[PDB]
Design a protein around this ligand. Structure first.
Ligand code: HEM
Ligand SMILES: CC[C@H]1OC(=O)[C@H](C)[C@@H](O)[C@H](C)[C@@H](O)[C@@H](C)C[C@@H](C)C(=O)[C@H](C)[C@@H](O)[C@H]1C
Length: 395
């Protein structure tokens, strides 16, 4: 009876035109998600998005029930941050949030700028043409989160594999993913356990203290924070570097406009954050705990809702010429980093990383162009997020 969401297999970074139709004439529409049972409201507009994400009457904890609609094979892990409601959620985030403040993240620009340069030095050693993914997109975020978290850099292939499986949408089965979660939890649990009598000066260390020094928080929750930070810490930024670079080079003018004014980069990062559907479709589901008014509908208590971040970021009531990509927007109140209690904790880290990668490239490689055809570009399929597996560039 009700439409299947996602509405189509994704292509590149392009939005299904049905989102625009929905925004205009049915901003809160009912849908059938690929897993779980029953039905959920899809929220396509910014005003409503902020209510689902921002309001205390929406619970993510309530979506841990296997019967709830969701975008992924496995029932959500109860111990994950996305599934915690405040105040427990607040305490959990407090454990680690100090290190992610705008101010602390800013402290890293120097380590991060060196790291980027070093990895771009190794790209020039190789010489054009080269795979931007191989040389920059993967190794840069991976190094940063490894050094931040205190995760062995030699284990990249291990945690990348794990992380890719947990961000599966259509690709893997419930059992394959459920398998990987236990391995990953055991891996992380072993990693924090190494600090029982070898305390470290890193997040995993702080995480280890919390497991032997906390009454409010379970060990499952504390350990799962480590896996959430490690998955997110690289999966987002790695794909997001390729996404911005794709958007820049497909219409060379954009890349050209940044070479002209490298101070634009930060605003262009914020723009491309708004434009890009990093989350391919949907979001972690929020279940209403009381009736809640949206634009066109009152969501009833127990009814699930899901948000498409990218569609809210194409809302014509809040962005002028929203279907157009523009680095000179005066205001840009996007929700590329979500909104409310679960606003991404690495928003400042992601920004730092994207700024520094894009700056360095725009300074150093003015003659950067896509050295493979747009048609054969290998976008990743059946994962909850989008990005390229390779990006061969010439200079
Ligand atoms: C370009 C970079 C990034 C983008 C676009 C991005 C996007 C998002 C979005 C949209 C959410 C909201 C999910 C929801 O509430 O339904 C989110 C949550 C999250 N992000 Fe990110 N993110 C980025 C970078 C990072 C980084 C670098 C880390 C970690 C180092 C990270 C860790 C997280 C975590 C843990 C959450 C969930 C926290 C919670 O449940 O409260 N993200 N991110
Ligand atoms: C339905 C789409 C979402 O994926 C999920 O909910 C996944 C099942 C989460 O368990 C993933 C693996 C967690 O590690 C996140 C903390 C990663 C972080 C980057 C995000 O929050 C991300 C935006 C995420 O919410 C969306 C991709």
């Amino acid at each position: 009876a009700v439409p299947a969401y996602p509405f189509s297999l994704p292509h590149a970074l392009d939005l299904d035109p049905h989102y625009a139709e929905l925004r205009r004439d049915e901003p809160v529409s009912r849908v059938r998600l690929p897993y779980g049972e029953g039905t959920a409201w899809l929220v396509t507009r910014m005003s409503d998005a902020r209510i689902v994400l921002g309001d205390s009457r929406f619970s993510t904890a309530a979506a841990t029930d296997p019967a709830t609609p969701r975008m992924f094979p496995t029932p959500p892990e109860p111990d994950g941050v996305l599934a915690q409601d405040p105040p427990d959620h607040t305490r959990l985030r407090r454990l680690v949030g100090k290190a992610f403040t705008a101010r602390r993240v800013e402290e890293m620009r120097p380590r991060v700028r060196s790291l980027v340069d070093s990895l771009l030095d190794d790209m020039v050693a190789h010489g054009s043409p080269a795979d931007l993914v191989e040389f920059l997109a993967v190794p840069f975020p991976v190094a940063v989160i490894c050094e931040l978290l205190g995760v062995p850099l030699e284990d990249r292939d291990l945690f990348r594999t794990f992380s890719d499986a947990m961000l599966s949408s259509t690709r893997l089965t419930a059992a394959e993913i459920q398998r990987v979660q236990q391995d990953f939890m055991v891996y992380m649990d072993g990693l924090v356990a190494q600090r029982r009598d070898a305390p470290t000066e890193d997040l995993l260390g702080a995480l280890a203290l919390a497991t032997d020094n906390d009454d409010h928080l379970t060990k499952g929750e504390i350990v799962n924070m480590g896996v959430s930070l490690l998955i997110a810490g690289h999966e987002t930024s790695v794909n997001q570097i390729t996404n911005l670079v794709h958007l820049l080079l497909t219409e060379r003018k954009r890349y050209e406009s940044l070479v002209a004014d490298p101070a634009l980069v930060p605003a262009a990062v914020e723009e491309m954050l708004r434009y890009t559907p990093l989350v391919s479709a949907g979001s972690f589901v929020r279940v209403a705990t009381e009736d809640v008014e949206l634009s066109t509908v009152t969501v009833r208590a127990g009814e699930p809702c899901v948000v498409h971040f990218a569609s809210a970021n194409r809302d014509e009531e809040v962005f002028d010429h929203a279907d157009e990509l523009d680095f000179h927007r005066e205001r840009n109140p996007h929700i590329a980093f979500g909104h409310g209690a679960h606003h991404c904790i690495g928003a400042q880290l992601g920004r730092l990383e994207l700024q520094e990668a894009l700056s360095a490239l725009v300074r150093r490689f003015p003659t950067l162009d896509l050295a493979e055809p747009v048609a054969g570009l290998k976008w990743k399929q059946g994962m909850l997020i989008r990005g390229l597996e390779r990006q061969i560039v010439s200079w």
